[PDB]
Each structure stands twice: as C-alpha cells, then as structure tokens.
C-alpha cells in the first residue's frame, strides 16, 4: 500500500504533466495562428493604403494633363507632394518620376481575411 500509494501519486502526477504539456503546445499553435492573422491584416492595411494613395497621385496627374489644375501652384503643389511622398516611402522609385507598387498581401493572404 505505501508503495501502491506512491505508485499512484506518481501515476496521477504524470497524467498532469502529459495533459498540461499538450495543452501548452496547443496554446503555442493558436499564438502562431493569431500572430499569423495580424501580420496578414497589417499587410492588407498597407496594400489598401498605397492603392488609395496611388490613385490620388494619378488623379492629380490626370487633371494636370487636360490642364484642369496647376500643380506648380502652391496650395496645390502641397497636396501633390503629399501623394508623391507616400509613393516614395511605399514603392520602388524607378527612373525619376516613376514608381513600382509591390503588394504585400497576396491572394492567399487576402483570403485568410474572410
């Protein structure tokens, strides 16, 4: 019996190690998924943002072609540079006056977002 008793406590106690060990691995897996969504969601917010800013620059570049607006004018030059800044900070500057917008959130990533 004392032996039996010690044998039991040791059996019970190994159940606990085993249960807790596994639950921890589960918790580690969920953490990876969650942090997974977050890094996708933020890639999307980023992609979303350069889309809208790249449109803004385009619209300006559209209106100055049909001479609807003056981009050298000051008040208007501000706005124009506001859009050109975002483009530089968030896109590949090719030959002066061009940009290559690379999207960070691909189709698969856009998907997790659903």
């Amino acid at each position: 019996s004392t032996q039996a008793a010690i044998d039991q406590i040791n059996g019970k106690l190994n159940r606990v190690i085993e249960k807790t060990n596994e639950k921890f691995h589960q918790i580690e897996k969920e953490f990876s998924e969650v942090e997974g969504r977050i890094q996708d969601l933020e890639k999307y917010v980023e992609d979303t943002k350069i889309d809208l800013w790249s449109y803004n620059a385009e619209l300006l570049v559209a209106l100055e072609n049909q001479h609807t607006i003056d981009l050298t004018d000051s008040e208007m030059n501000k706005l124009f540079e506001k859009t050109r800044r975002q483009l530089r900070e968030n896109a590949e500057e090719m030959g002066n006056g061009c940009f290559k917008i690379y999207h960070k959130c691909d189709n698969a990533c856009i998907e997790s977002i659903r």
Binding site: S54, L60, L87, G97, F99, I101
Partner: peptide
C-alpha cells in the same frame, strides 16, 4: 508602374 511629373 506609376509615373508622375
């Protein structure tokens, strides 16, 4: 590719 002025 987007080209401004």
């Amino acid at each position: 590719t987007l080209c401004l002025g």
